[PDB]
Point group: D2
Chain length 233, copies 4
């Protein structure tokens, strides 16, 4: 269950789910690189890791940019080591297209190192439900369908190398779309969730921590729903 001796990269680590993931992997003993798109977000990450006794760094990374990805990886490899645990946490058509093209960019870049080690964990984090109505449902379901299929396919491609590829599909998690809702809306929402509560960011992080472990070595191509029983597609 422990990750001592491993380097983990967590994209979008400055708040909410990404931050929780960074802290959890740190708690399990990994060296953690968390990333944000701004210098201010990188500084927040570095302060957070320091405050929690986690070794690593806060770096600026734009996953939409081949240049930013190549430059950031080379920097990590020179100063911390090769990341063997990569957690991807950084209208419906353009959103899905952009997001899967980013996942593909980052995954390809980190796979060289994983192939050298003959070991790896790629864990892709889905989007939380972003909005209540029909457009929200369309977007949530399309993004999740894309993520599920992308994950299954990359897992096939890299499996002979003892690299697993999985996803975590969060439902309604306690974050700002939810934290800003009128009470009538929050109540209606909670009524669709069998557990009758929103998820905590730490509850997504614990699942990620398990997927990253040696105990999950035979889990690949999977999408683990973390949604308190609320299934939408």
């Amino acid at each position: 269950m422990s990750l001592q001796g491993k380097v983990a990269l967590v994209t979008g680590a400055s708040r909410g789910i990404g931050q929780a993931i960074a802290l959890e992997l740190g708690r399990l003993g990994a060296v953690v690189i968390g990333t944000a798109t701004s210098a201010s977000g990188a500084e927040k990450i570095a302060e957070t890791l320091k405050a929690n006794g986690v070794e690593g760094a806060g770096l600026v990374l734009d996953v939409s940019s081949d240049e930013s990805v190549a430059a950031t990886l080379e920097h990590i490899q020179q100063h911390l080591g090769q990341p063997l645990i990569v957690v991807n946490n950084a209208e419906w058509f353009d959103v899905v297209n952009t997001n899967l093209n980013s996942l593909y960019r980052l995954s390809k870049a980190v796979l060289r190192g994983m192939t050298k080690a003959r070991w790896g964990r790629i864990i892709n984090i889905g989007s939380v439900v972003g909005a209540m109505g029909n457009a929200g449902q369309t977007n949530y379901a399309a993004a999740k369908a894309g993520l599920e299929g992308f994950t299954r396919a990359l897992a096939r491609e890299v499996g002979s190398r003892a690299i697993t590829v999985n996803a975590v599909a969060p439902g309604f998690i306690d974050t700002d779309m939810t934290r800003e809702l009128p009470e009538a809306q929050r109540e209606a929402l909670l009524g669709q969730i069998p557990l009758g509560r929103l998820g905590q960011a730490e509850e997504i992080a614990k699942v990620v921590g398990f997927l990253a472990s040696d105990g999950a070595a035979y889990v690949t191509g999977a999408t683990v729903p973390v949604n308190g029983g609320m299934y939408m597609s």
Copy 2:
């Protein structure tokens, strides 16, 4: 006499032990996956009741628990029988306490309808029986173990897929039903797992099998058991209605 209840026998605090003596019931614990689950829940600090259909199986479980330092028992239980389920649960409650982790791994094997029907009816019988105690505790974990791929050809594929589809829908529906009580209900769907059957395959046939699996190897029973352990934990509290495939990337439907 045949004796049907066998105890383990029972100041080192292992870091892994987080389930703080919660009682776990693992059906079909005498070998393979079920045995691995029973051991993993013991490593995690549960009191483990493992079951088999015979007194000899129940004794073998108790010896396994003993040899591994796990507190608990090997008991006879037939999940196909209302009488056996009722009587056995009452016995557990009187002697060891209310099972709040229940792992359904017992299950029987043109066959497809009667197999799936029998199996889902058993899952429902046992699950409904343990729910009072979980409801009273306002906490529970029900974990359902799917069937491994049992045979290579078309009848095998039909069975495997029909069982898996039944288990996935069942799990989701029972999760919906019992969620307001902070009971989770999840499934684990194994792929090809290294057992006595698969070790004895001719090399040409093992090779063809491994070719269908991205990881290029059979799964270990312990690799199923670790997933079960996680799902039993407080960290999986928001995971419910889920079926977790543990198959090395080999997805058959």
Copy 3:
């Protein structure tokens, strides 16, 4: 030899006295089948026979209880003796406000009955080396969570049952498919307050309830020779309203 035509075929449609089942019986009739529609009561069987007559469809209304081995055997014997072997079988005979604990008994009963009838009519199809089995799913039965739990469980059960049976019987050129309705224009829909009807229509992309005839047209197509390579499929007929 014509696309879509069911001339020369005998179709059994269970639960044919109203709504979706009646629409199916009339659609298969329009396509040229001899149609045996069934109900659980003599009254329902008479209504079917009158409906068929009124529409110029040859066939009969019979009393059938799919829960009973004796009823199933008797009904098949009657049909074989007087009309011939049914080679198209359409299953539409599913069994305090609805709660989320009802899904198990309902699904268990409905799949058991479906298996019973399907196994019985397979002998005749196996002999003919041709068949169509078409299973109709249950519409959404209530608004809210219990409604969704129950609808989803039934649909999941029917999808898996359909796919498995198709696999079992495919080598005999018998196809087995399902049609999974969404919200169809029926009484639970009528009883809703207008604000509730509006909210319901807002979960459906097409913005309307489906008609029984829209289910029936899918069934007619599946029954046809043109659908001979479609097997093990569940066709959703739900106006874009997907819930599982």
Copy 4:
């Protein structure tokens, strides 16, 4: 009842196999059919096929990868035949090329779909029917590609249906299994045999069996079917 009289249909990749069969089936039902190919010679062959089957319409050159080709083709059709309100999108493998294949194909579906949606939105009626890939390519890479494309098509179809449904436009997909085409007909015998053994019906499907499903989906009887992917695979499900 099944009639498409008065409707214009555009069928991409109509010069052979499944696309050709679709063109002919929509024509049998009474549609005016515009079938496309990537070359002038393919477009002329389409036109001769239509004539030989008594179907009104035309062959045209279309490159679904090109915004310019798509815009120019639609402007041509609108000027000479009318607005297509039925559109059928029909136009070794490597272990790490599945992403670029799916990405390209979906980007092309989206490009053509968005272009024909204007006319359908104006009419408040339409049918978009997307045809998936045929099973057959060799090895694990073939399986990876097939499965990824299928998952992409299913989700794409469901999402676009949600987006356009309020306009009485339906959007559905057909997912073929192992179909008798020019591309499967001469696969190595061991591969054909292995695939046949995975198919309950025990035979390859015919292109016409795909076309009949498309014909049904284009009909008014399918007006409540949207966002669906209909598998047409003889019971052989590959995921």
